[PDB]
Antibody, heavy 230, light 213 residues
Framework: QVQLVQSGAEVKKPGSSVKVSCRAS????????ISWVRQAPGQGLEWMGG????????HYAQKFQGRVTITADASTSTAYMELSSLRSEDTAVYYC????????????????????WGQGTLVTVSSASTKGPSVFPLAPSSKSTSGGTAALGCLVKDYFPEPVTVSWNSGALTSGVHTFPAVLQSSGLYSLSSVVTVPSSSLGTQTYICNVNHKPSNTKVDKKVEPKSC | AIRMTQSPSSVSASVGDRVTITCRAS??????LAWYQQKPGKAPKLLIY???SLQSGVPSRFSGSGSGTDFTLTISSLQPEDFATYYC?????????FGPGTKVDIKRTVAAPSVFIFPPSDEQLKSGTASVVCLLNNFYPREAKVQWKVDNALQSGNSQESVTEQDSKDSTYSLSSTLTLSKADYEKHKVYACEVTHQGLSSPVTKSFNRGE
């Protein structure tokens, strides 16, 4: 029975508001508190507030009071969380979760054990608009070889939003590939590298191509990676 | 107001090991303490509530103890599915607060990074920016330090890095560090150096090139 199904990922501008839904199974809605907890990328967990859906009673963490509104609707078995005046700071996965006060019979909030969680809803806050990547070679050289093997790659720069996908030689090359997590630059655009190690002898005969797709902008770049004089 | 702390920040263990993590509250919370497991890309899952009560369906190799301010999570015989981040949460009072997490990763023998360097492409330079990349490949443990040097002058604030998840085959990490300058600055200096510090190296290793070769 128990299910907390959240709405899809959101991309918002600074100053706007976002409203996330958490659709619940009937028994969960009727008997328990629904709590909201967020997690910024690479970070810990932060309580925002919770609601008693059958009454609509809401308590908020002090930090979010004035910006957060939690609501519930019985005719849809759903709880909503609205966060206003968004900033880049608010970029996070937003979780709903059920509080279960066992072993205590009386009361809704305490102890605040979050026993089931929704899948999360990613909210990304940025002034950037949709934009495909520029793809640069990371050229193999005598400064990218160890023993009989050479490292080479592609720098996938200045795109928004996540994600991009990178393959090598149209998928025929998987072994020794490391596609790194994207970093958010100070410009609001993401940037990522993908590297692969190969046998150095092959660099005479074997061409290496990275294949970079960014679905949001309908862009694809194939970049031939060529040795450098370094 | 109730601050939660955890130690260690990370642990390396092998399948079959006993692993103990500690959590501490800044004031007493009786036994109103929960533990959660989280894996990458996934929601937290409840393991322990009331400090020591095992959540239904959770394997009995997980167990908790403690009351007041000091608490322990123990995994008695670790399995491959237990490599994850563990968080504590005080359930005593508003605002509910979580500890910062303890990551349990896979132990293997020490492996020094192979260190490679990549100058910026011809293409990028025309467009007015220069990205220099330093790759630290297949190392263990996770802990590592990169420093960028340009004509031997140390750099700060103009570089970014990320790290892959522990490799499922060889249990290593790789790390990418990017140094970003304008074309104007990049063409003022000659020698671009990545200096890497890590347990597996007996002293810090430098890889570099001369601009225009």
């Amino acid at each position: 029975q128990v299910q907390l199904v959240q709405s899809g990922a959101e991309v918002k501008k600074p100053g706007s508001s976002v409203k996330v839904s958490c659709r619940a199974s009937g028994g969960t809605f009727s008997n328990y508190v629904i709590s909201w907890v967020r997690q910024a990328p690479g970070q810990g967990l932060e309580w925002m507030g919770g609601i008693i859906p059958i009454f609509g009673t809401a308590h908020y963490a002090q930090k979010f009071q004035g910006r957060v509104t939690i609501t519930a609707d019985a005719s849809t078995s759903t709880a909503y969380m609205e966060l206003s005046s968004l900033r880049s700071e608010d970029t996070a996965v937003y979780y709903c979760a059920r509080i279960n006060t066992s072993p205590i019979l009386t009361g809704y909030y305490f102890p605040g054990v979050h026993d089931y969680w929704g899948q999360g809803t990613l909210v990304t806050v940025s002034s950037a608009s949709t934009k495909g990547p520029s793809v640069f070679p990371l050229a193999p050289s005598s400064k990218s070889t160890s023993g009989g093997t050479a490292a080479l790659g592609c720098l996938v720069k200045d795109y928004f939003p996540e994600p991009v996908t990178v393959s090598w030689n149209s998928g025929a090359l998987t072994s020794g590939v490391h596609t790194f997590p994207a970093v958010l630059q100070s410009s609001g655009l993401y940037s990522l590298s993908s590297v692969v190690t190969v046998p150095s002898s092959s660099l005479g005969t074997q061409t290496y191509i990275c294949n970079v797709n960014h679905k949001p902008s309908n862009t694809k770049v194939d970049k031939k990676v060529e040795p450098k004089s370094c | 107001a109730i601050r939660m702390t955890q130690s260690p920040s990370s642990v390396s263990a092998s399948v079959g090991d006993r692993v103990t993590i500690t959590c501490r509250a800044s004031q007493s919370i009786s036994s109103w303490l929960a533990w959660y497991q989280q894996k990458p890309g996934k929601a937290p899952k409840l393991l322990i509530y009331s400090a020591s009560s095992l959540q239904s369906g959770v394997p009995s190799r997980f167990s908790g103890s403690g009351s007041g301010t000091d608490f322990t999570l123990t995994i008695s015989s670790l399995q491959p599915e237990d490599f994850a981040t563990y968080y504590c949460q005080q359930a005593n009072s508003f605002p509910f607060t979580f500890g910062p997490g303890t990551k349990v990763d896979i132990k293997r023998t020490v492996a020094a990074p192979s260190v490679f360097i990549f100058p910026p492409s011809d293409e990028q330079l025309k467009s007015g920016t220069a990205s220099v990349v330093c790759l630290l490949n297949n190392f263990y443990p996770r802990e590592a330090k990169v420093q960028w040097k340009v004509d031997n002058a140390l750099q700060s604030g103009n570089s970014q890095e990320s790290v892959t998840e522990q490799d499922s085959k060889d249990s290593t990490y790789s790390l990418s560090s990017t140094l970003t300058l304008s074309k104007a600055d990049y063409e003022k200096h000659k020698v671009y150096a990545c200096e890497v510090t890590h347990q597996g190296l007996s002293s810090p290793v430098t890889k570099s090139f001369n601009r225009g070769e």
